[PDB]
């Protein structure tokens, strides 16, 4: 149980081929989308 002072967020993408039970909520949850600086 370390302090946890690290900046990093993985990303496990999944296609309908392996998980056809995925909805816009799940699919989109695996995206970052346009995020301009600031």
């Amino acid at each position: 149980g370390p302090l946890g002072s690290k900046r990093f967020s993985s990303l496990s993408y999944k296609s309908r081929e392996e998980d056809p039970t995925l909805t816009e909520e799940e699919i989109s949850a695996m995206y970052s989308s346009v995020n301009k600086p600031g």
């Binding site: 967020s9 296609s15 970052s32």
Partner: protein, 99 residues
């Protein structure tokens, strides 16, 4: 090439293929592939410090757009913009994921 010189566009890649492809962390490595979860659109995968960022590409009226504000006429010009500047990307494009 298929229709010019757009190797970065696989137009046919899975999650396992896209994951391994972006194994080595290198800001500037991007790749486009037909959206599996969403048929008819494309998805741009970039490697940011080892992280794989997926950008959904909406294709409507023969125009592409990810921010729903900047529409293009093709994927070629679209990448050119994201390559010259972030435009909403964790890291501007530098080297296309050649296949």
């Amino acid at each position: 090439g298929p229709l010019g010189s757009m190797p970065w566009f696989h137009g046919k890649i899975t999650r396992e293929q896209a994951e391994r492809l972006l194994y080595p962390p290198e800001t500037g490595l991007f790749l486009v592939r037909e959206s599996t979860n969403y048929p008819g659109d494309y998805t741009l995968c970039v490697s940011c410090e080892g992280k794989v960022e997926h950008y959904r590409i909406m294709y409507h009226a023969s125009k592409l757009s990810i921010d729903e504000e900047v529409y293009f006429e093709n994927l070629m010009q679209l990448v050119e913009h994201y390559t010259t500047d972030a435009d909403g990307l964790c890291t501007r494009l530098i080297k296309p994921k050649v296949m």
